[PDB]
Structures are given as C-alpha cells and as structure tokens.
Design an enzyme around this catalytic site. Sequence first.
Site, PDB file in Angstrom:
ATOM      1  N   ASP A 190       0.817  -1.207   0.000  1.00  0.00           N
ATOM      2  CA  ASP A 190       0.000   0.000   0.000  1.00  0.00           C
ATOM      3  C   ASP A 190       0.855   1.263   0.000  1.00  0.00           C
ATOM      4  OD1 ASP A 190      -1.953  -1.934   0.260  1.00  0.00           O
ATOM      5  OD2 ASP A 190      -2.243  -1.583   2.406  1.00  0.00           O
TER       6      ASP A 190
ATOM      7  N   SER B 184       2.043   7.237  -0.302  1.00  0.00           N
ATOM      8  CA  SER B 184       1.283   6.510   0.706  1.00  0.00           C
ATOM      9  C   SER B 184      -0.185   6.529   0.312  1.00  0.00           C
ATOM     10  CB  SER B 184       1.468   7.127   2.095  1.00  0.00           C
ATOM     11  OG  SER B 184       0.757   6.394   3.076  1.00  0.00           O
ATOM     12  N   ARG B 185      -0.802   5.349   0.249  1.00  0.00           N
ATOM     13  CA  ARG B 185      -2.183   5.262  -0.216  1.00  0.00           C
ATOM     14  C   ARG B 185      -3.177   5.719   0.846  1.00  0.00           C
ATOM     15  NH1 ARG B 185      -2.016   0.999  -4.609  1.00  0.00           N
ATOM     16  NH2 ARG B 185      -4.216   0.572  -4.139  1.00  0.00           N
ATOM     17  N   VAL B 186      -2.897   5.442   2.122  1.00  0.00           N
ATOM     18  CA  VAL B 186      -3.815   5.847   3.184  1.00  0.00           C
ATOM     19  C   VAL B 186      -3.909   7.366   3.258  1.00  0.00           C
ATOM     20  CG1 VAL B 186      -4.319   5.684   5.636  1.00  0.00           C
ATOM     21  CG2 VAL B 186      -3.371   3.727   4.433  1.00  0.00           C
TER      22      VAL B 186
END
Lengths: 48, 463, 463, 489, 129, 129
Positions: F94, F119-121
């Site tokens: 991710d 960063s995907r979050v």
Amino acid sequence: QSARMVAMKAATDNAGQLIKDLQLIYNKLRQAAITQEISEIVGGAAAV
Amino acid sequence: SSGRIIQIIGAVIDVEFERTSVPKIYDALQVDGTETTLEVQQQLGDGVVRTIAMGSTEGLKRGLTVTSTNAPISVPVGTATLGRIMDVLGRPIDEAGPVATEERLPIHRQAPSYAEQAASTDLLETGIKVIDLLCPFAKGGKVGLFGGAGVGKTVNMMELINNIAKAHSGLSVFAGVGERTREGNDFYHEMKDSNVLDKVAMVYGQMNEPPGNRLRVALTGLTMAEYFRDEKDENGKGRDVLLFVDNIYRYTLAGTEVSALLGRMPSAVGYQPTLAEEMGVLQERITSTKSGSITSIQAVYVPADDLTDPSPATTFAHLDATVVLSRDIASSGIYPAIDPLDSTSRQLDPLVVGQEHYEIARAVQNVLQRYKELKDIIAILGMDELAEEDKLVVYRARKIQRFFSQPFHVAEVFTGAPGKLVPLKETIRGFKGLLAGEYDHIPEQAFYMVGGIDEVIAKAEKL
Amino acid sequence: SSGRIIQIIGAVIDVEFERTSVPKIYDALQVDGTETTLEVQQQLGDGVVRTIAMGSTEGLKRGLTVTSTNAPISVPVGTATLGRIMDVLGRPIDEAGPVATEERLPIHRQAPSYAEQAASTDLLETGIKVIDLLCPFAKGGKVGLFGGAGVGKTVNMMELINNIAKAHSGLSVFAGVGERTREGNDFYHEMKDSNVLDKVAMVYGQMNEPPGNRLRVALTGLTMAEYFRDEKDENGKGRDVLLFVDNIYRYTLAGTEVSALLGRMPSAVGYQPTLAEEMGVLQERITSTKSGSITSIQAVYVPADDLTDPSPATTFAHLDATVVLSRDIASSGIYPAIDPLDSTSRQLDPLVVGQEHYEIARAVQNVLQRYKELKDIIAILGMDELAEEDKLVVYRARKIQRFFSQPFHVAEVFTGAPGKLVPLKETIRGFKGLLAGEYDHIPEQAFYMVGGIDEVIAKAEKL
Amino acid sequence: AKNEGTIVMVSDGIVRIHGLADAMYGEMIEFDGGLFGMALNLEQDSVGAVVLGNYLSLQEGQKARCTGRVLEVPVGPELLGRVVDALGNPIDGKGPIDAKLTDAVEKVAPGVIWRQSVDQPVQTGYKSVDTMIPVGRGQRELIIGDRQTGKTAMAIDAIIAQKNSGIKCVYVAIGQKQSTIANVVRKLEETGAMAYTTVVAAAAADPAAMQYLAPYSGCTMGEYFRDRGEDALIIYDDLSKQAVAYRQISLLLRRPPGREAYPGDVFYLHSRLLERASRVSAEYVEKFTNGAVTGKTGSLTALPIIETQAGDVSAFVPTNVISITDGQIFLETSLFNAGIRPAVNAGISVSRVGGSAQTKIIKKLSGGIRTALAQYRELAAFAQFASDLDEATRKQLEHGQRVTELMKQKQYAPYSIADQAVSVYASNEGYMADVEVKKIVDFDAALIAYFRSEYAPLMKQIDETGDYNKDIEAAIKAGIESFKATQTY
Amino acid sequence: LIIYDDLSKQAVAYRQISLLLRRPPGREAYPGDVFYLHSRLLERASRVSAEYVEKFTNGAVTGKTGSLTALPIIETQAGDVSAFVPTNVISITDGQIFLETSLFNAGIRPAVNAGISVSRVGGSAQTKI
Amino acid sequence: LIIYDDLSKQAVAYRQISLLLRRPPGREAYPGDVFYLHSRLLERASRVSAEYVEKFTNGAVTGKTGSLTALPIIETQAGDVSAFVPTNVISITDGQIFLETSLFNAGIRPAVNAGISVSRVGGSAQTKI
Ligand SMILES: Nc1ncnc2c1ncn2[C@@H]1O[C@H](COP(=O)(O)OP(=O)(O)OP(=O)(O)O)[C@@H](O)[C@H]1O
Ligand SMILES: Nc1ncnc2c1ncn2[C@@H]1O[C@H](COP(=O)(O)OP(=O)(O)O)[C@@H](O)[C@H]1O
Ligand SMILES: [Mg+2]
Ligand SMILES: [Mg+2]
C-alpha cells in the site's frame, strides 16, 4: 562570431564520439540480453 | 536394403534401415514413386537415420519405401552446363532440355592438403583501374562486396565475368543462396541481353524453399568451379575460375535454421553451436592449387549494423579484400561507383606488389583524404582564403576522381562506346605522371570515362 | 564391506556399496592400489553414494575397489605445523619430513552459536592513506578486497601483511585456494629469509589442481586457525590469530564446475542453486568468539568487471569492511586503485572514530560525488560553460584523486621508488587543509605518490 | 570381449560406444581404418568418445579396441625443423620422424617447492617490450589485441631473435587458413629459423577435437627441454579458437551454459595449460635425470595470443586469461591505423615479474617510464578544455609526445641492448627536449648509426655484459654530447 | 490484390500451436521454421507470363498475363524493427512503407516517412505523366 | 508492528528449496507460486472491527479494535526495479519508500526520494495538528 564557430565545431565532434561509445555499449547489452533470455527459455523447456 | 519412413515432423524425416546397411552421413536417399529425395544428417540407435527432405513433405504418409544411393548428392559437371539454370539437385529449370553431360561429381569433399598449396601469391588482373590499383585481388583470395541495390552490382558481376573470360580464358559459376525470384528472372534476361550468359553456369536457391535447399546450394557451384579448374588441356596449366555467392549471410541463417530444426542447444545470440566450422568448410576449398585457381566474390549483409555480431565476425576472418559501393559516387555520375577510401585489401603491402606500386597507391589515398578533409572547409567558408598547395591538391583530386571511371563491355549495346581492358602498367604510369605534376594543364573533362592515358592525351588534344 | 566403482565422469565418481554398510555424508574413502581418496556428497538409494575424488582421474576404470574409513577428513593441528607447508589432505610438501603431532581435528564442523559472539574492539592502524580515512579497520573484524583481473589485489594484500603483521605478537595462517603457483614460491622464501617463518603456517591448493582439491582447501586453513584461536596456555593466555585467505571466488567456481555433474538443476547465470547456503556455511566460521579473536583479510574476484554478478553480490553482506578496486582508476596510473565511493566500513561512526574524522570523510565523499555528476556537460560542452563553484569542485576533486595515491614497500621492484608510511593524523591534517581552502596554488602534478603533505609542499618547487 | 566394443551412435563427431568394459579415462581407442579416439565419460552402460580425425567414414555397428595407453606424442631433438599435425604425424612430405621417446599429453605442473624465481632475460628486439614489459625465462606473457593489428608479427620476431641465444622454439597454429601456415613456414625457412623450430598445425577445416588438443601436445613437446636443464619458447597463435572449439564440443554434449554460452571448466581449461610453463630448480633436474646432469636449471617461456572484439578487454575470456598469466601486451587498433606500427598501449599493459628479468643497465635506466605514459594519456585526453596552464602541463605533454614517438620500430629490425640503452638514456637525460616532434625516429636512427660506426669497443662491451658504472655512463654522455654537434640527422 | 491485416498475430498463433505441439524453441520461443512460414506465403504474389496463362487455360485465353499484388501489414513495439519477425519479413518484400507516431501527432495525417521508405521496382510501375 | 528485514533472502531460499524439489523454473529461474508466497503473507496485516474482537474474546473485552502493521524490506541491484521480485512485491503493498544511493553519497542522510514515494492511506493516518 569566430569563437562561436570554433566552439560549435568542437561540440559536434564530441557529440559524435559519445554517440559511438554509447552505440558500442548498447550493442553489447542487447546481445547479452538475447543470450540470457534464450538460456532461460531452454532451461524452462527442458524442465518439463 | 530398403527402408520405411517412421516420423514426419515438418521437414525432419526419420527412416529405419536394416541392421547392417545403414547409410553414412550425407548419403542421399530416394523415395520410390514420389519425386522427393532425402539427405542424412545424424545416426541414432536401432538402425534409425534422421534425415531432411529436399522437396516438400505435403502428401507423404508413414510406411513408404526409400532406396539408398550410397553416395552424396552428385551433380553434372562439364562444358555442357554453360548458360543453363539448375537447382540444388542439378536439374534444369529453364525448359531448355536435359543437360548433355553424363559425368558427375560428389558435392561433399575434403579441402586440399597443406602440401598442395601454391608456393607464391600472384595477383589477378581484371582490367578495372580502381580495383587493380587500390584493392588488388589475389589468385585464391576472397573479396567481400558491400553494396545495396541501385548502385550497379549486377553490372559489375557481368563485367568481371566478361573480363576474366576474355583475358585469362576462364569461366565463372554463379550461386544464388536464398534469392528472390523476380530478381533471378531479371538477372537471367539481362545476361541474355548482354551476350554474357554463354560463358557462365548458375544454380538457383529460391527464397521459398526449405532450408535444406538453401543450405547446400553453394556446394554445387563449388563443385562445378572445382571441375572447371582441374580440367587440363595440353601441358596441364589448369584454368582460372571465379565464383559468385549472392549473399553469405543467408548461408549462415539457413545453417542456423537447420540446426534449430534438428534440435540442439543454441549458442550465443541464438546461433548454432557449429558455426565457425560450418563456414570454414566452405571457405577452405577456395584456394590456389599447383594446377589452377579459384577466386570468390561474396556479398555480405551486416545485421543491425553490428560488426561484432557472430556472423560478420566469423565471415571477416576469411576475407582478403572489401569493395564498397557508395551511393554518392553513383549520384555524382561516376561508374563503377566504388569508394576509393573505404575499400581495403590485404595485398597492398610493399613485399607482395613491390615498392613503387605501394608508394603510388598510398600517395593517391593521401591526396584523396586531404581533399575529403578540405571539402567541408571549402563549403563552410569558400574556395578563397586558401594557399596554392591546397588548390593543387583539390585539382589533382578532381582529376583522379574523374580518371577512376571507365566504360564497360556490357554497356556497348546501350551507349555504343567500346569497352576497355586497361592493363596495370598503364594505370601505374598514368597515376605516377599525374602525381608528379606533368598533366597539370590538361582540362579535367578529358579524364572522364576515357580509359587509358594516351586516350586522355588524344581526347584533350581533340578538345 | 568393500565398494565398487560404477561410473566415472569428470571429477565426480559414484560408488555402489552393500545394503547395510553405506557410509555417511562427508566420510572419506580410499581406493586400493592408488593414491586417490574420495569423499561422500549425496545418497541415491540402492546403496549408491555420489562422491568427489580428492585427486586426479588417471588410469581409473569402472570396477575398482574402495575401502571406507568411516570418518571425515582429519588434519594435523597444534604448534608443530608452524613453519610448514601442507596440501589439502594435510601432508607436507616442503621436503622437510613428517609433522610430529597426533592431534587431529575433523575438517567439517558447525558454526559457533549466538551466545558466544563478541563485540568489536580498538581501531587497527595500517598506514594506507585511503584505508585509514574512508574504511577504518577493527581488531577481530573481517576485511574484503573487491576488484577485477589485474587491478592489484595481491599487491595490496602483501602490503597489508607487511604493514600490520610485523608489529604483532601471535600466530598467522595463509591459505591459497586457486591462485598462481609462482606467487606461492615467493612468499615462502621471503618469510624464510626474513626470519619470520617460525610462527606461520601455510596450506596451498592452486589453479593447476583438479576441482576436488580447490574445493576443500580453505576448510583446512580454517580448522588450523580455529584451533589456534581456541587454545589457551596455562594461566589462560590468548594468541590473537590472523588469517589470510586468497581468492574465495575459486571455491564457488569449483562448486559451480561440479554442481551440474552432481545432478542439480541450473540457476540464474548458470550458477548452482545452493550458492548462498555454501557461502554462509564457509563464512560463518571466520569469526571471533568470546574465547579468542581472529582478524582476517580476503580477496574477492569480480567476474567480467561487474559487481551485480550473483557471486560477488552475495558476499557483500558477510564482511564489516569492503574495499572496491576499479579498472578505470588503475588504467590512469593511480595506485592503489581503490574507489573512494562504493567503499564503506562499519567503523565510520561518530561515536567510534570521533567528530572530526567523520566530518572530513563526509566532506571528501560529498565533493567527489558532486564532481562525478558533471561528467556529461564537460564531455559535450567545454570547461568554460560552468559556474566558478563547479570549477573549484572539479579542481579539488582532481587534487583529491591524486592525493590518495602513495608508493608501497612491496611494489619497489616494479618501479624503484622507496616505500612510504603515513600516520593517521597526518592524513587528517592534510585533508582538512585541502578542503579548508589552502593549497589552491599548488599544481596537481605535485600530489602524485608523495605520502605525507610536507612532502607535497617540498615537491611543489620541483614539478 | 572386454577390450572390444561396437558403435551405436555417430553425430557431429562424437561417438557413443557400447561395451569396452575395461578402459581408463583419456585412453586411446582405435577404430577400423587408422582412426584414433579418446574416452570422455564412462557411464553405467556405455562409453563416450570424440574422434581425432575424419568421422565421416564411421558407421553404426563397427568395431573398436582399447590400446592400453593414454594420449602420447613423439618427443625429442629429431623434431626440429619439421611440420606435424596435432598428433605428431608429419604433413610436409619430408619423410617419417625417427622418434625415441613418447610423453603424456595431459599432466600436472610441478609443486611449489620445485620452482625458482626468474632472473634470466629473454630478448625480442622491440624497444617497447624490452624496456617497459620485460620477459624472462620461465615467465608467461600474453599478447592481447584486435584483429588485423600485428599480433603474429611480434611472435615471429621473437622466434627469429633467438638465433644466437641457443633456445629451442615451438609454434602452434590453431584454426588458421592453410595458406597463412604455408607462408609462415616459408618466412621461417627464409631466415634460417627453421633449424631449431617445430610447427604444429591445426587448420580451420580440421575437426574441433584436433584444434582442442593441439596446445597440450605442443606444450608436451616443449617440456622435453625444460626437464633437462635447457630453455625453450612456445607460442599459441590463438587460444580463442581453442575456447570456441571447446564450447562447441561442450554444447554438442548438452552441458548447461553460462556467460556468453560458455560452460564451466573454461578457466580450468586455460589454466591447466599455462601453469606448465615454469622454471624448475637444479634439484628437480637432478632427480628427473637420475644424476645425469647436475647444476642446471630448466625453463619454458610461453607467449599466448588472444583477440578481442572492438577493443573490449572486459569480456569473459579476455579477462579469464589475464587473471592467469604474468602480464599482457595490448595492441590498439586506433594507434595502428594512426601510424604507430608497434602499437603498444601503456597503462593497460603490465609485467608482473618486473625488473628482476633485465640486465643491470636496462633495469636501472628504464625505471618508471610506463606509469608516466599512462598518466600522460589521460592528461592529453583531458587537457583540451583549458586556456592558460603553467609550464608543468606543457612539459609533461611534450615529454609524453616525444616518448610516444621514440618507441616506433619497423618489422624484421631487431635492436641490441646497447642501442636501447643509448636511446633510453638520451630520452631520460632530456637531450631531445629541443628536438622537434618530427624527425625523432631519424634522430635516434642517426645516433645509433654514429654510435655503432664509432665507439665500437664500448658498444660491444655493453652488448656482452649488461653492467654500467660511472665510467660507462660518462662515456655514453661524452659520446652523445659529441654527436649533438658537428653531425646531421 | 490481397491485404493481410496483421501477420504478427498469425506468427503469434503459429508460435502457440508449435509450442503446444512440443517443437524445439529458439529466439523469442519461436520454432525453427518461422522464416519459411512467411517466405512461402509471400512468394505466391507474382506476375505470370502469357505462356503460363495459355497453358493453364488450354488455349481458352490468349495474349493475356495474370498478376497478384500483396500488401502485408506488420506492427512494431516502440519502433523496434530489429525484432525477429519484422526482420524476417522486411528481407522478403520489395519495399517498405514506414508510418511514424511522431509524424501522426505532428499533423501529417497520412504520416509517411519519406527517406527510409523504398520501392525496388521504382519508376517501372508508373504511367508516363 | 512487525518488520521483515529482507524478503529477497526468503525468495532465494524458497527458490533453492523448490528447485531442489525439481519444479519447473521460469523467469530468472524462479518457479511458479512466488507471487502467492509473498502475497499470502502480507495480506494478514489489517485492522479488525470491535465486533471481531468481541467475538474472538467471547465478550472478555468490548469496544476495542486491533491492528497489525507490516514493514518489509527489499534490496535492488543497481536500482533495477524491473526485476522479478521487486515488481511482484510493489503491486501488493500500500505504498513504497525509495532510498537512492546517489542521495546517500551526496549528503542527504535520510535519503528518501520524494515524488516517487507515495502513501495510499494518506492524511487519514495523521494526528490533527
Ligand atoms: N611494426 C610493423 N611495421 C610495419 N608493418 C607492420 C608492423 N607490424 C605488422 N605490420 C604489418 O601489418 C599487418 C598485420 O598483419 P599480421 O599478420 O601481423 O596481423 P595479425 O594480428 O596476426 O592478424 P590476423 O591474425 O587477424 O590475420 C601485416 O601486413 C604486417 O606486415
Ligand atoms: N600497488 C601497486 N603499485 C604498483 N603496481 C601495481 C600495484 N598493484 C598491482 N600493480 C601492477 O599490476 C600487476 C598485477 O598485480 P597484482 O597485485 O597481481 O594485481 P591483481 O592481483 O589484481 O591481478 C603487476 O604487474 C603490477 O605492476
Ligand atoms: Mg590475485
Ligand atoms: Mg595472425
């Protein structure tokens, strides 16, 4: 103007030499890649 | 004594034989009823021979009978093959009738031994000024032809055939390895028009044939040339023969395809493991013997403009000279279009050809190089702002450039101007005189397509 | 029971045994009537074991007899091996008589556990200008030398032996694992006539031996070094052993040469599938436990001058200090040809070497890296098309490159100039002065093979 | 039946034999028709073998038998002045060779304790070699270069230069055209070098098994004088062709490939051969000859040749061998076409023996002239981007140009030690600083001519013994100072 | 006149069939005879003489000559004309027509790269004007 | 929070084990089921709702949520992220953090390459301030 003449001529010659060297490197890399892929394929085919 | 097909996979055919009578390697076989013929390539266990068909495998089942000739492929050789077209099997494909020759020779043979090599190196005279001066040939040598289409390759080959036949009383053999059919028809008709066909024998390997046909087609021409060389008249003396290969690259490619068909581990960059040996088999039979000689002209294609590729690397280890056909020279109205600076020869050394010949050749090359390095200066700034020695160099270089051209025999039926066969001495004398400065007043136009040097003087006087 | 050879191929021999007497793995076997001995590598059922001959295969045939010793290969250990030369099996080859010792240890053993590992210690002073600055040593650590063919691994190793093994009290071991035999005859006589042979041991297996010998030589020297490390005199005295292993790459090369015959599927670039396990198995025994210490130097071969090959890349994680040699630098006359970049050590820590040392090293590396990125603009354009700061960077980097070269005591025969030794504080002072801004008037020709910096100043007035 | 077998497969020159229950590894095998083969692998049921000859006459179901002896060749002093193939059979038609001994083709080199350091120089006649890359008896030096650059000329010159030294020579031709071999033999016979030379030939049309085995037979023939307190010199004209033949044999045998489709044991293949060229001590000779000769040391010098593609010394086989020999001589295409005929590239060519294989005068005079040239090459490559430089750069560039012009020589023109010493002293002392870059060859040619027409006793004294002291150096200085004036180049 | 929309996909299908038929592979896993596959197909586009037409028609048609023209199409990946199949087919035909991605975006809608496109027949196949 | 120091070594060990078991290799001699090997391990790092915790503990703890954070490490050769294992693993995670050897020598001590790292979050994994 004369100095710009000389500078550009030198630049052309240098660029040509660099092109030749890079072409040699590229040819060597291409041959190595072909050999590596052929070896991998032959091994995989001999596995089965 | 007879066999029977057991496997058919594309071109590879396996034949099972008796316990004892198992044909040797390269021994041709014949299929009864069907036209096709087979060639041995590898022996396996239990009397099984792995072969390659020379025709086509459509319409062949399992269980047919095969008869063994117990000998390699034999082809007709003699004087009756001059002016006839044949395939790899030595069968006419011109609808002109059967070949009158009755004697045959095998196409697989060992090269002459070490004791049969000639005791000297002698030059071969062609009558072309630039070739004789800057890229001298050699009896038994190999010449690589580097040139594309539209620059006069076929005209050069026909001119060389005519020149050798007229001067040295020799013959020629032409072999086409994987050639186009349209170009083959055009070549045949062009030669028939130019009255050259009746002193040459050809074998055609078509581009649409199985690789076995295009692999063994050079050996037939080799055998025919070998018979022509060894044919002795009174007092022996043999003959001097030529041999043309349309493309040496396709020979190696056909070998690679056949090796892949049979099944064996590929070498570097996918080439066959037996490459240098396969090429040395062909190139070691072109030698000068105590009775006669054979010279070869070969056209070489460089894949991907990579001089380090295995095929050109293996090819260049046998070549003695290179002829480069340039497009700028052809576009400048100079024929034959042969580059005088990019053409090299191993015989251009003082020991072989003498001292003065070497000196004159290097002086001419130096003058040409100086003119080449001054051309861009002339273009970028002008003819002016230069001293006198450079101007003299320019004028002499232009005179040499014009003098390198000459008319040909095979162009008489088109233009009407007679052909020329200038000998080496006259060329040496003329170029030495030109370099000395004696002919500094003759107009440059008198040097264009004239031939010798007294012809130059006469043409200048007429103007 | 007795054995019976059933198949010999290359250096790999398999022996068929009885049903209930099959020897274990790594056990040594003997062939009656010959000097050849075997060791077990694999079991295959039917009482069949695959073995590697610790000798040569001449006059060997299918159907001989083999007697099993039921024990691994054992070598003599103790204080009586000092000043002697031995081969893989532990037999003297110096024509001096047998080694008088009954102590013997197995050549195969497990690595020490995690609970008997020791920390680092003081810094080792070497006298090399470039090692002492960008790659500090440490007592009990491991050092590796990475370079191509003909770059100077052997000369650097000999200089390291000459510089740090003289101001030392203790034993030392030298092992040859596949290098030139001529070099092995110069080391012995130099130590003999320098009166230092009395406290050294030697084991030699060179490049003229079959792969069996070159595969297990390093284990013998490893066993001797381990015994010297673990031995305590009365009142508990240490020894502080040193180990000098020559090319480790030949160990993996022999493994590769035999792996395919052992019956293992190939891996990437043709290597054996078990490269990392073997490398770790050998490399985990070269360690300093809590009962002793070993300071070892090794030379690693880089095949085809690329560091991404699977063999050199796996070894990078087994060392504390890594020294990298480049052919580019060597081809410019700079000696030693150690790459300032790409060379790292674990001891370059502000808490280990101090605050000034770390800052000077970081500044030097930053300057060199900044200079490296300008190689294209200067190549295409001129030198004048740069800012003044870039010109200063280029000049300082060139002076730094010259200043990293010094003459050696060992390399006097090649050149003739006497050797030099430089203390660490002189190096720190010189580089601090060079980076500070002074020495901007001294020509870069005065920084070549000078040693100190006062010598640079003195030489500035000559060249 | 234990010594007789039958052929079951023939393909590409490799024969698998069923039977032959008692045969050793590498033993000779006799076919019907005078064809010999050697074993390669002894499986559980069958035996593999390669054919040393023309395999086109072999068929399945024929017969073979085991001789009981490993590969052997005739060795002795009767082979001098003859031309044979890889098995020792003459091909020149001059009759049979009356041999007296035979030796094994594959064997191991002597041990570490049986060797000696090399200290006796070997002369070749080239200034660029005898002053910067010395060669001594027992040392092995590599000749590396491109195609069409002059590698074979150097070896022939080195062979010719041994007319008065009294050391034998061996010449091996692998994968070459027959015309080239005949021309080389003719040239050797022209100069009388055939009186102490042997030639082993394996042409391009010969089987790969013959091009593979030739260097080992040549080395075995050369070892005869090494074992008996006498010197020798062996040249392998192309080890690349041997590597190619070995690769072909291995690939036809289904061995897994590696880098550039080369298998393992290639390094072993090229290492077990060059390790046999060494100098042995007097004790080894005494033991070998059983006291027949005492107080004599043998030697064997090797000069292998390897060719590269586009001047790339970083490839696999070109580097493998570099990591074996004791130096290399690199010939560059770029310099050869420029005009520098003995195009020796300093900086990339080194000698591992060093000054221990030189005469005293040459060892002292020729000190560190290769490193200076290596530095000058890069300085000249880089210093075209400057405007104003101090006199140091000008002096270094001028000295580099003068030195690179000094070391030019013509073919078949050997130089004595005295000529090299005089020229090197003249270059080092700075007497040629004021001379133009051109006419440098004319200058030193005239200087040598004047120093040979006069100063004959000094020149001959230097020639016989290579020592010099204050007197000899003073005489050299006085002579060159006298020549500097009142003379014309 | 015949047009083959993509010989590359035919080559891919032939490779799949050969690989599933256990034929020995090679460069890019293509089988041994992949040059023959296109050579024997493209050599059938030819012009025959009046004698061939007279013999085939058994005198039904006289004084006429037949013909057959081919326009094969091949796709390259990132302009790599050095691949196996583009090189195999370039050396069989009598010319090439090169279309450039850059010329297409630049506004030259046909996008023909004159300079590297050639015709071996030349001016022999044109009208007078 | 769990950290795997080098997944490349695990890949090499798995390749050795599989090859010694005579399983057909593939690209770079890696046999099949490598993506499965490195995907069935990372998929176990996740957050669980309070209901899952309550069911697992049989009501021992209520109103509490668990989590498990992964942090593997992979080594490249001369910055070749086009190899087998790096490509097989990049598509799974991710986000990535890239460390450049050029910036480390330059002077950037935490040599993190911005722009190519992501960063995907995103911002949801940050404190308010
Ligand atoms: N020092 C020299 N001066 C003048 N000519 C030279 C010199 N050295 C070599 N030559 C000439 O240059 C050419 C080089 O040929 P040579 O046979 O020496 O090369 P090679 O490296 O063996 O080539 P190949 O084996 O690839 O055919 C020959 O014509 C030779 O006479
Ligand atoms: N430190 C050095 N100083 C000078 N010359 C060297 C040095 N190291 C190597 N050389 C040169 O390189 C050659 C090979 O030396 P060696 O130590 O064997 O290098 P390597 O072991 O890397 O092949 C020698 O002939 C020598 O002249
Ligand atoms: Mg070494
Ligand atoms: Mg040569």
